[PDB]
Amino acid sequence: GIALKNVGRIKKHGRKHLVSKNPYLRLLVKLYNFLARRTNANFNKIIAKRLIMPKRYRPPLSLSKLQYHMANHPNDIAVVVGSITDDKRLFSLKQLKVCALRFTETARKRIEDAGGECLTFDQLALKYPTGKKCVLLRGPTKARTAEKHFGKAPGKPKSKARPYVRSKGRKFEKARGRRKSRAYKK
Amino acid sequence: KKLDVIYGKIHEKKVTKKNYILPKSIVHNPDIYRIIHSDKVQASLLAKKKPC
Amino acid sequence: PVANVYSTNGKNVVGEVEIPVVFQTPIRNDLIQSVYTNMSKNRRHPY
Amino acid sequence: PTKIWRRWGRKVNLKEKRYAVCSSIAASGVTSLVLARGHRISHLKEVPLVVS
Amino acid sequence: SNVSNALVWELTRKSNCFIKKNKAGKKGVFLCDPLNVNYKNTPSSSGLVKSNSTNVTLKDGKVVFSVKVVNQHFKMKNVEKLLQQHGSKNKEKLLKKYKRLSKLY
Amino acid sequence: AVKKVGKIIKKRTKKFTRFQSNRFMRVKPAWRKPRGIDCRVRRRYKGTNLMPSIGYGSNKKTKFLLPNNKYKYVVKNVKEMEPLIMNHTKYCVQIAHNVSSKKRKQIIERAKQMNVSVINAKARL
Amino acid sequence: ATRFKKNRKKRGHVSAGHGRVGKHRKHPGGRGKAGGLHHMRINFDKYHPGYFGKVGMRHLNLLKNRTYCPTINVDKLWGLLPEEKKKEFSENKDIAPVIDVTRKGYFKVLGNGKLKHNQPIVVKARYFSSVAEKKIKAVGGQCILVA
RNA sequence: UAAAGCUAAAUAUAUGUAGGAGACCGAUAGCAAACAAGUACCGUGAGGGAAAGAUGAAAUAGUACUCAGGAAUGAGCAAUUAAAUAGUACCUGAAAUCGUUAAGAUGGAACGGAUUAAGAGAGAAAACAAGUAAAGAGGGGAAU
RNA sequence: AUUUUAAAAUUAUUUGAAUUUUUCUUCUUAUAAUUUAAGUUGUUUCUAUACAGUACUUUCUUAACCCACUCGUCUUGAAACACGGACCAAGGAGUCUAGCAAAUGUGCAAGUGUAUAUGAUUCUUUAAACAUUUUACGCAUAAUUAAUGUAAUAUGUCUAUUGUAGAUUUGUGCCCCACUUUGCAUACAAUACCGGUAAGCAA
RNA sequence: UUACCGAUACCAAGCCAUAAAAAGAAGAAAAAAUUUUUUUUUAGAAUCUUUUUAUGAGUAGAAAAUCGUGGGGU
């Protein structure tokens, strides 16, 4: 017998393999795993890791946020492992070179009209194998509604978690425990 | 010939699928081994290392 | 990108036709399989 | 006991159905895939074959 | 474009009318392509994955020579000259496969 | 006890039998893991029906191959020997149980002229 | 789908994963929302704080059609109209678009977001936010009340 | 515009009848009932309520004849059938349980684990001999 | 099939030096080899000059040495003088629907789902497939208040709040590191602004 | 005071699996006969291949990979 943590086996956490059986995504994962192995590039390693992530961890990036993040590098290209969505709040776009998994039709048309272009990750590997002049970006991973219910339970003091309710009227979870007039608040 | 009309090229009123756009691929060209054998990434690859 | 049109008599070739752009969509065997498993469920008769 | 109110059918997204049909046409357009599916096409001239 | 050798391998590595598993002796998996010289289920040997390939196969009691659009199906010296005329180690493997097929009734 | 024939090591023979299957006819000898609460075999008491474990697994270099140092392949057709034309030295052939005498004779002929060995060569004659 | 069920993998495990001591009985805590305020009170207070009690006055019959009022913020007014016409309106300073948001399906215009500087725009709506109107006329536009 | 009245359609149909179907069940299942089934049978009564399908292609092939028996049956050198160890309980014919023969063990349990030894059954697919010459039977392919 | 290589050692020559002063002294200069390197190789027999036996492989049956309590279950604790089980066959138990959420896959994306229904030379299959003359509806896109209601920097500016860390990028000392450049996600705070409530003022 | 016997513990080696790691998307080797033949092989499946190290009890409970059955499409 030996006194070892976890009986002596190193335990990793998170994804180990691609779950999606999408042949194109599998080819892309193969290519970028090879790139990350054969080059020293943390850029390629990060892209290979992110291509594996679940849907909730490759969130969409809006055009406005893309342009805002790319504002200070007009000559480099922006690499997003999620999707690029159009933003109607943005008035004008300006010449963006962006590689991404997928582009919504409106975002694609807007980028092309602005004169930049949309790239796939195979083209990104072909033209920038080590990520020169390439800025890795990701959308808000914690902005989704599911996260609003997480953390401290709604009912703990100073908790910002939304409760699970059928509706949010005056007569749905608003009386005792949410105001001083009925027992306590929060 | 009617396939193009149905799926968006040279559309007509009662034939083309209204407001339908053909799906777009995740990859531009799936010949990943051609891109790997391209000289641009061949130059970027480090020297082959050895196993245990 | 064109395809030859053949007469019903197979020994002759008549005017060619440009291949429609729908032949360039991703092949997506997984998507086809999942959609098929969902779709083939709709013709079932109850028991 | 088996009941008639089992979920017999399924609602499939129209976009996904159209994607599947387009992909099936594209797959029928490539020679290797037809051979793999099991059609004896070793003697036809081209797999996207069209006739008058 | 839309298709590639790697993509075809992705589609056909599992679902295939030519794949024969070895259910009883668990370790064998064969691919019986018309253009598979050695019957490995491997993208470097798969007939429908390779762009160009040649092999010999007995068909209806006749050994035929097949070359891979691009499908020829011709009928030892003749085999050598056909291989040299349609050639793109593999040649020697093909020759020995033909010499083994020639002993079949 | 292990038996060693050439490069082949069979780490254990005399296949595991289900606990108490020797003295109950309704309990078949096919192995079942005793779930139990106080089950002797589950607790690994001395001298009773040891349980199978992954430690008994065979060397994977010689795992599935027969005493003739070949992997067996079961065929039901003459057309199912084409893969064996390129593997005649490390595959032996076995004819499927439900193949008639005519097809059996054809398969034996093809295997011999393919110099592939047949396991059940003299069946149904 | 029945062959992917978790109960299948406990086929020969006696208790079916429900415990050897506690067992799987029939409603051991009550039915539905039975124990609120008594023995499910911790769950109710931890996950559904304001559940018990009543607050506010009754509205005897509602008729939601009376108060139905979709809203749009000022930062989407320019995006309502197509890109080419947006370019034309921004290029030509002698004319401005007047947009009837009611036709698009909005009754009230709210004031969140930033309008383009020095780009006049006229908006027709049933209701306006104070800040929305302030921004509209700050960029040189006008708010028009319609019904 | 109450205290009078009529009115088709779109709607529903665990009933009856008649059609058509199924990723349904396949005789302990499926209706209780595949059959002479709401039958037999039970209860004073209200009611309760089963079990039970399959020889064979053809019985327009359902066992002729002989011997022995009072008979049932049995046997045959006799007989239908492709087949009677398909003989009406008849397709197949498992287990429990029992019989015959053989082999073995046997001092108040029997079985078993692990290791061998002695016997008794089976066995050649690694558990030797590729090739070479002759004659005998064959099969193919190429060559005009 | 491009580290069983390199070296290390040893042998036989050879160069110079050192030294414990030498037939295993050491250190290199070159060459050629060998293994003590760089995880077992060789010889001789036998099987056997057989085609299945008295041998070899294997199954079974018996012994023999050592060990071995009745399984399932409740239980702190079962071999229990705790309960169920005489035997065998067949049947026999986390399922279906509604609704919610999480997880993951898929499609599209500030939209998404074409509901009921319609049409169509589709009408064995087909009760499925296909389709929908340029604000139906659900959910989402905005919150807050019992509520009349009110409703998110704010026109100096197509800059898009501020810090501390932080991925990626940029150069200087195409591959190590410290300065520069940019500053994703996120975390911790700060700020504004919206709804409600206080407080001050209040035509 | 010695020697010895004595574990599923310890040590060396082999093998199975688990975990982690190093790395990876094309060319002739040998033997037997007599320059010519013969016999084997001559590999490249990324949840894959090669190699390396450590580790392995388990009720209640959880998960993965496998093995079977009726029926459907291919």
Side-chain angles (χ1 to χ4, degrees):
Chain A
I2 183 143
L4 286 158
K5 284 178 213 215
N6 194 60
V7 106
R9 307 195 168 111
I10 299 149
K11 38 161 66 177
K12 300 289 274 333
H13 312 278
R15 284 233 155 130
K16 296 156 171 14
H17 304 300
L18 182 69
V19 175
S20 152
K21 305 150 132 172
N22 179 2
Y24 297 90
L25 180 62
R26 270 169 65 71
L27 283 181
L28 217 62
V29 162
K30 263 152 188 179
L31 157 77
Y32 264 91
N33 275 343
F34 172 86
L35 257 294
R37 178 162 54 76
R38 287 308 304 284
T39 84
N40 50 31
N42 298 325
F43 180 85
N44 292 323
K45 287 186 192 178
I46 294 175
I47 282 176
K49 166 94 147 72
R50 287 187 191 175
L51 284 169
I52 291 305
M53 295 195 186
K55 200 224 206 172
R56 75 184 156 123
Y57 271 115
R58 33 188 220 267
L61 187 65
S62 64
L63 273 180
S64 41
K65 282 305 242 220
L66 176 65
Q67 163 184 292
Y68 174 82
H69 295 332
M70 285 320 264
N72 274 105
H73 349 75
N75 301 137
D76 320 331
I77 102 109
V79 188
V80 174
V81 196
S83 320
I84 309 290
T85 56
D86 181 30
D87 197 344
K88 316 299 297 310
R89 294 161 305 188
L90 200 59
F91 192 93
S92 78
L93 207 54
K94 40 164 62 204
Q95 259 275 21
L96 291 188
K97 288 192 294 221
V98 47
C99 163
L101 262 198
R102 29 189 74 103
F103 299 80
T104 69
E105 281 325 299
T106 44
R108 203 192 268 286
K109 185 203 205 352
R110 222 173 154 180
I111 296 190
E112 271 146 10
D113 294 8
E117 91 275 30
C118 307
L119 296 179
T120 62
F121 276 89
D122 65 292
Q123 301 174 273
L124 177 80
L126 190 46
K127 277 154 222 192
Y128 316 90
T130 68
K132 256 52 165 48
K133 299 302 211 312
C134 287
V135 174
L136 266 177
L137 297 177
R138 53 192 146 172
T141 61
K142 218 165 251 198
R144 54 161 196 158
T145 293
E147 290 289 320
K148 272 151 171 296
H149 296 273
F150 294 163
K152 274 183 314 266
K156 294 320 212 182
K158 313 309 182 264
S159 157
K160 312 262 168 282
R162 285 162 161 211
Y164 289 113
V165 279
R166 339 199 285 262
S167 33
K168 58 177 314 189
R170 72 163 179 74
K171 71 149 78 76
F172 298 100
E173 254 93 315
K174 276 263 270 194
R176 168 203 175 270
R178 282 205 181 274
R179 59 186 65 231
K180 229 95 60 55
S181 34
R182 317 288 200 279
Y184 64 106
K185 174 181 174 51
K186 219 75 176 74
Chain B
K1 303 188 63 46
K2 174 156 260 180
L3 263 190
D4 272 323
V5 172
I6 292 181
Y7 278 115
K9 304 258 276 186
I10 39 184
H11 91 110
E12 39 206 86
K13 282 277 198 302
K14 294 269 193 204
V15 180
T16 195
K17 285 191 207 283
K18 151 168 274 183
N19 283 309
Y20 179 72
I21 306 164
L22 278 177
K24 222 141 292 183
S25 177
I26 279 303
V27 317
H28 175 254
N29 204 343
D31 193 348
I32 68 172
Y33 295 120
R34 174 191 71 61
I35 101 103
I36 286 186
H37 296 145
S38 74
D39 79 19
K40 169 67 145 194
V41 320
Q42 276 300 314
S44 99
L45 301 190
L46 288 190
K48 253 191 194 209
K49 303 176 180 145
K50 322 199 88 35
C52 316
Chain C
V2 287
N4 304 296
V5 185
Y6 298 82
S7 53
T8 37
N9 153 282
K11 82 164 50 52
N12 204 357
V13 163
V14 313
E16 78 198 9
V17 158
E18 191 160 309
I19 300 190
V21 68
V22 74
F23 278 89
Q24 278 314 284
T25 79
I27 294 187
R28 286 316 288 287
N29 74 311
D30 62 322
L31 190 140
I32 290 169
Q33 183 204 110
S34 71
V35 170
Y36 184 92
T37 70
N38 285 331
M39 172 164 326
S40 61
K41 228 153 274 175
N42 295 332
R43 70 146 295 283
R44 299 195 290 173
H45 286 39
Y47 61 85
Chain D
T2 53
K3 297 289 166 69
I4 54 137
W5 56 72
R6 203 199 288 259
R7 303 182 37 234
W8 298 109
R10 298 286 184 279
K11 162 186 146 68
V12 196
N13 292 334
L14 175 65
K15 273 161 192 163
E16 301 208 42
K17 285 144 66 164
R18 292 180 162 170
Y19 199 147
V21 169
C22 297
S23 274
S24 300
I25 296 153
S28 87
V30 18
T31 298
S32 272
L33 293 194
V34 181
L35 255 184
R37 215 216 69 91
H39 304 278
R40 325 280 219 243
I41 63 168
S42 300
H43 282 14
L44 45 56
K45 263 76 73 183
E46 62 173 283
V47 88
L49 90 160
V50 300
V51 297
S52 46
Chain E
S1 79
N2 168 49
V3 84
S4 168
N5 288 348
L7 187 282
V8 161
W9 167 246
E10 286 307 318
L11 302 169
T12 49
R13 45 181 210 91
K14 264 152 69 52
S15 180
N16 207 331
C17 80
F18 296 117
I19 284 174
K20 314 289 311 155
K21 281 175 164 177
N22 195 13
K23 189 215 164 147
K26 311 281 311 163
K27 103 156 313 287
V29 165
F30 299 117
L31 186 55
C32 296
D33 289 343
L35 284 320
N36 218 334
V37 38
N38 54 81
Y39 296 72
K40 273 164 168 146
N41 181 28
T42 283
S44 60
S45 86
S46 163
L48 60 172
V49 171
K50 284 152 109 184
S51 314
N52 293 114
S53 84
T54 65
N55 87 337
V56 287
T57 298
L58 75 178
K59 254 172 91 183
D60 202 4
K62 274 288 163 43
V63 176
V64 313
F65 180 86
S66 37
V67 165
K68 192 206 178 198
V69 74
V70 288
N71 274 325
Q72 315 283 91
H73 318 268
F74 308 102
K75 93 88 176 156
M76 177 41 120
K77 302 300 295 313
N78 162 72
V79 154
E80 271 165 310
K81 77 162 302 314
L82 272 173
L83 186 47
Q84 167 299 340
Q85 153 194 310
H86 291 312
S88 188
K89 204 165 114 205
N90 308 342
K91 304 73 191 183
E92 147 184 312
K93 187 188 291 183
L94 201 33
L95 291 193
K96 96 155 39 184
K97 170 165 186 185
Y98 168 77
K99 105 169 305 304
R100 292 217 262 252
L101 284 168
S102 71
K103 322 202 169 289
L104 265 47
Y105 144 81
Chain F
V2 322
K3 56 153 318 178
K4 159 154 191 17
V5 183
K7 276 340 185 63
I8 283 162
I9 281 191
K10 297 268 189 260
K11 205 163 310 167
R12 145 100 181 202
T13 322
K14 71 171 314 226
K15 306 291 153 182
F16 305 82
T17 55
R18 172 148 175 211
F19 176 48
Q20 277 185 325
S21 68
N22 46 327
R23 41 169 179 231
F24 282 111
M25 313 167 270
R26 67 190 179 251
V27 178
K28 317 211 184 70
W31 170 254
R32 298 273 182 287
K33 185 173 190 74
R35 218 72 51 172
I37 271 300
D38 28 78
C39 191
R40 204 184 287 293
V41 168
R42 186 191 65 76
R43 304 152 89 163
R44 312 185 168 112
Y45 276 29
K46 202 166 72 271
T48 166
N49 281 89
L50 26 69
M51 313 191 266
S53 97
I54 197 58
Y56 291 97
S58 308
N59 195 334
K60 44 190 162 292
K61 285 153 108 76
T62 79
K63 178 151 185 200
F64 293 106
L65 59 77
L66 267 53
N68 57 5
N69 304 267
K70 302 210 251 268
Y71 304 110
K72 94 145 152 204
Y73 185 62
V74 178
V75 305
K76 26 202 91 156
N77 291 310
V78 182
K79 191 255 203 161
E80 301 186 10
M81 322 271 293
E82 291 56 9
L84 302 200
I85 197 50
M86 292 291 69
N87 299 281
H88 75 111
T89 216
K90 63 150 196 183
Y91 278 90
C92 55
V93 89
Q94 180 184 76
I95 300 199
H97 71 284
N98 55 359
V99 172
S100 61
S101 279
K102 290 167 55 72
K103 193 150 313 173
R104 271 185 143 90
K105 287 185 214 95
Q106 293 164 20
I107 291 175
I108 307 284
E109 263 309 320
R110 167 68 38 94
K112 181 19 165 159
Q113 73 194 200
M114 262 169 72
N115 79 346
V116 170
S117 52
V118 186
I119 294 328
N120 51 349
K122 48 194 88 153
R124 310 172 162 221
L125 49 97
Chain G
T2 207
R3 82 258 195 205
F4 299 131
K5 283 181 193 292
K6 151 197 205 261
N7 181 54
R8 288 224 77 73
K9 79 217 311 300
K10 316 273 160 43
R11 250 307 165 207
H13 291 61
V14 182
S15 288
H18 277 94
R20 221 179 251 274
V21 167
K23 306 187 218 295
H24 187 191
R25 297 264 150 99
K26 338 178 58 56
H27 315 105
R31 290 217 201 204
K33 307 187 284 185
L37 280 190
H38 286 300
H39 60 282
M40 317 271 198
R41 173 193 283 245
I42 303 196
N43 183 282
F44 273 72
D45 295 7
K46 190 188 177 170
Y47 300 125
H48 311 102
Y51 175 68
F52 292 105
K54 43 170 146 146
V55 172
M57 40 176 167
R58 286 130 65 228
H59 195 321
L60 272 195
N61 75 345
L62 187 43
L63 294 181
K64 305 231 208 150
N65 280 27
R66 276 177 194 182
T67 43
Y68 170 86
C69 180
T71 62
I72 181 184
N73 294 283
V74 289
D75 53 17
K76 325 212 95 176
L77 301 170
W78 278 108
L80 278 191
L81 63 77
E83 201 76 50
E84 45 284 48
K85 274 212 271 163
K86 198 158 84 184
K87 174 212 171 43
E88 140 187 332
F89 277 124
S90 98
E91 278 334 289
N92 183 9
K93 54 92 171 183
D94 286 326
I95 52 56
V98 25
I99 296 157
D100 193 316
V101 307
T102 312
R103 175 89 177 80
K104 292 307 286 198
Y106 307 98
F107 286 5
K108 185 167 187 176
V109 172
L110 292 187
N112 177 87
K114 153 84 170 283
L115 289 159
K116 182 131 179 52
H117 197 250
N118 294 142
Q119 282 293 338
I121 170 169
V122 175
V123 184
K124 299 208 260 191
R126 277 174 200 207
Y127 310 95
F128 277 98
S129 181
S130 150
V131 172
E133 159 164 72
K134 284 212 270 282
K135 293 182 183 182
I136 285 320
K137 47 208 311 165
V139 304
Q142 178 204 345
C143 295
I144 286 170
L145 292 179
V146 299

Coordinates of all heavy atoms in Angstrom, one line a residue, chain E residues 39-69:
Chain E
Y39 N -6.8 -4.9 -48.2 CA -8.2 -4.7 -47.8 C -8.3 -4.0 -46.5 O -9.3 -4.1 -45.8 CB -8.9 -6.0 -47.8 CG -9.0 -6.6 -49.2 CD1 -7.9 -7.2 -49.7 CD2 -10.2 -6.6 -49.9 CE1 -7.9 -7.8 -51.0 CE2 -10.2 -7.2 -51.2 CZ -9.1 -7.8 -51.7 OH -9.2 -8.4 -52.9
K40 N -7.3 -3.2 -46.1 CA -7.3 -2.4 -44.9 C -8.4 -1.3 -45.0 O -8.6 -0.7 -46.0 CB -6.0 -1.8 -44.6 CG -5.0 -2.7 -43.8 CD -3.6 -2.2 -43.9 CE -2.7 -3.0 -42.9 NZ -1.4 -3.2 -43.4
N41 N -9.1 -1.1 -43.9 CA -10.0 0.0 -43.8 C -9.3 1.2 -43.3 O -9.3 1.6 -42.1 CB -11.2 -0.3 -42.8 CG -12.2 0.8 -42.7 OD1 -12.4 1.6 -43.6 ND2 -12.8 0.8 -41.5
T42 N -8.5 1.8 -44.2 CA -7.6 2.9 -43.9 C -7.6 3.9 -45.0 O -7.7 3.6 -46.2 CB -6.1 2.3 -43.8 OG1 -6.0 1.6 -42.6 CG2 -5.1 3.3 -44.0
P43 N -7.6 5.2 -44.7 CA -7.7 6.2 -45.7 C -6.5 6.2 -46.8 O -6.8 6.6 -47.9 CB -7.6 7.5 -44.9 CG -7.0 7.2 -43.6 CD -7.5 5.8 -43.4
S44 N -5.4 5.7 -46.4 CA -4.3 5.6 -47.4 C -4.4 4.4 -48.3 O -3.7 4.3 -49.3 CB -2.9 5.5 -46.7 OG -2.8 4.4 -45.8
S45 N -5.3 3.4 -48.0 CA -5.6 2.3 -48.8 C -7.0 2.3 -49.4 O -7.3 1.6 -50.4 CB -5.3 1.0 -48.1 OG -6.5 0.6 -47.4
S46 N -7.9 3.1 -48.8 CA -9.3 3.0 -49.2 C -9.5 3.5 -50.7 O -9.0 4.6 -51.0 CB -10.2 3.9 -48.3 OG -11.4 4.2 -48.9
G47 N -10.2 2.7 -51.5 CA -10.3 3.0 -52.9 C -11.2 4.2 -53.1 O -10.8 5.0 -54.0
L48 N -12.2 4.4 -52.3 CA -13.0 5.6 -52.5 C -12.5 6.9 -51.9 O -13.0 8.0 -52.2 CB -14.5 5.4 -52.0 CG -14.9 5.0 -50.6 CD1 -16.3 5.0 -50.5 CD2 -14.4 3.6 -50.3
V49 N -11.4 6.8 -51.1 CA -10.8 7.9 -50.5 C -9.6 8.4 -51.4 O -9.4 9.6 -51.6 CB -10.3 7.6 -49.1 CG1 -9.4 8.7 -48.5 CG2 -11.5 7.5 -48.2
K50 N -8.8 7.4 -51.9 CA -7.7 7.8 -52.7 C -8.2 8.4 -54.0 O -9.2 8.0 -54.6 CB -6.9 6.5 -53.1 CG -5.9 6.0 -52.0 CD -5.7 4.6 -52.1 CE -4.3 4.3 -52.6 NZ -4.1 2.8 -52.8
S51 N -7.5 9.4 -54.5 CA -7.8 10.1 -55.8 C -7.4 9.1 -56.9 O -8.2 9.0 -57.9 CB -7.1 11.4 -55.9 OG -7.2 12.2 -54.7
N52 N -6.2 8.6 -56.9 CA -5.7 7.7 -57.9 C -5.3 6.4 -57.3 O -4.6 6.4 -56.3 CB -4.6 8.3 -58.7 CG -5.0 9.5 -59.5 OD1 -4.6 10.6 -59.2 ND2 -5.8 9.3 -60.5
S53 N -5.8 5.2 -57.8 CA -5.4 3.9 -57.3 C -5.6 2.9 -58.4 O -6.3 3.1 -59.4 CB -6.2 3.6 -56.1 OG -7.4 3.0 -56.5
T54 N -4.9 1.8 -58.3 CA -5.0 0.7 -59.2 C -5.0 -0.6 -58.4 O -4.4 -0.7 -57.3 CB -3.8 0.6 -60.2 OG1 -2.6 0.4 -59.4 CG2 -3.6 1.9 -60.9
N55 N -5.7 -1.6 -58.9 CA -5.7 -2.9 -58.3 C -6.1 -4.0 -59.2 O -6.5 -3.7 -60.4 CB -6.6 -2.9 -57.0 CG -8.0 -3.2 -57.2 OD1 -8.5 -3.1 -58.3 ND2 -8.7 -3.7 -56.2
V56 N -6.1 -5.2 -58.8 CA -6.5 -6.4 -59.5 C -7.5 -7.2 -58.7 O -7.3 -7.4 -57.5 CB -5.3 -7.3 -60.0 CG1 -4.5 -6.7 -61.1 CG2 -4.4 -7.6 -58.8
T57 N -8.6 -7.6 -59.3 CA -9.7 -8.3 -58.6 C -10.3 -9.3 -59.5 O -10.5 -9.0 -60.7 CB -10.7 -7.3 -58.1 OG1 -10.1 -6.4 -57.2 CG2 -11.8 -8.0 -57.4
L58 N -10.6 -10.5 -59.0 CA -11.3 -11.5 -59.8 C -12.8 -11.1 -59.9 O -13.4 -10.9 -58.9 CB -11.1 -12.9 -59.3 CG -11.8 -13.4 -58.0 CD1 -11.4 -14.9 -57.8 CD2 -11.5 -12.6 -56.8
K59 N -13.3 -11.1 -61.1 CA -14.7 -10.8 -61.4 C -15.3 -11.9 -62.3 O -14.8 -12.0 -63.4 CB -14.9 -9.4 -62.0 CG -15.4 -8.4 -61.0 CD -15.3 -7.0 -61.7 CE -16.6 -6.7 -62.4 NZ -16.6 -5.3 -63.1
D60 N -16.3 -12.6 -61.8 CA -17.0 -13.6 -62.5 C -16.0 -14.7 -63.1 O -16.0 -15.1 -64.2 CB -17.8 -13.1 -63.7 CG -18.9 -14.0 -64.1 OD1 -19.1 -15.1 -63.5 OD2 -19.6 -13.7 -65.1
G61 N -15.0 -15.0 -62.2 CA -14.0 -16.0 -62.6 C -12.9 -15.4 -63.5 O -12.1 -16.2 -64.1
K62 N -12.8 -14.1 -63.7 CA -11.8 -13.5 -64.5 C -11.1 -12.4 -63.7 O -11.8 -11.6 -63.0 CB -12.4 -12.9 -65.8 CG -12.6 -13.8 -66.9 CD -11.3 -14.2 -67.5 CE -11.4 -15.4 -68.4 NZ -12.6 -15.4 -69.3
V63 N -9.8 -12.5 -63.7 CA -9.0 -11.4 -63.0 C -8.9 -10.2 -63.9 O -8.5 -10.3 -65.0 CB -7.6 -12.0 -62.7 CG1 -6.7 -10.9 -62.1 CG2 -7.7 -13.2 -61.8
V64 N -9.4 -9.1 -63.4 CA -9.4 -7.8 -64.1 C -8.5 -6.8 -63.4 O -8.3 -6.9 -62.2 CB -10.8 -7.3 -64.2 CG1 -11.8 -8.4 -64.7 CG2 -11.3 -6.7 -62.9
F65 N -8.1 -5.8 -64.2 CA -7.2 -4.8 -63.7 C -8.0 -3.5 -63.7 O -8.4 -3.1 -64.8 CB -5.9 -4.7 -64.5 CG -5.0 -3.6 -64.2 CD1 -4.0 -3.9 -63.2 CD2 -5.0 -2.4 -64.8 CE1 -3.1 -2.9 -62.8 CE2 -4.1 -1.4 -64.4 CZ -3.2 -1.7 -63.4
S66 N -8.1 -2.8 -62.6 CA -8.9 -1.6 -62.5 C -8.1 -0.4 -62.1 O -7.2 -0.5 -61.2 CB -10.0 -1.8 -61.5 OG -9.6 -2.6 -60.4
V67 N -8.4 0.7 -62.7 CA -7.7 2.0 -62.5 C -8.7 3.1 -62.2 O -9.7 3.2 -62.8 CB -6.8 2.4 -63.7 CG1 -6.4 3.9 -63.6 CG2 -5.6 1.5 -63.9
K68 N -8.4 3.9 -61.1 CA -9.2 5.0 -60.8 C -8.4 6.3 -61.0 O -7.2 6.3 -60.9 CB -9.7 4.9 -59.3 CG -10.8 5.9 -59.0 CD -10.8 6.2 -57.5 CE -11.8 7.2 -57.1 NZ -11.5 7.8 -55.8
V69 N -15.8 9.1 -63.2 CA -14.5 9.6 -63.6 C -13.6 8.4 -63.5 O -13.7 7.5 -62.6 CB -14.0 10.7 -62.7 CG1 -13.6 10.3 -61.3 CG2 -12.8 11.5 -63.4

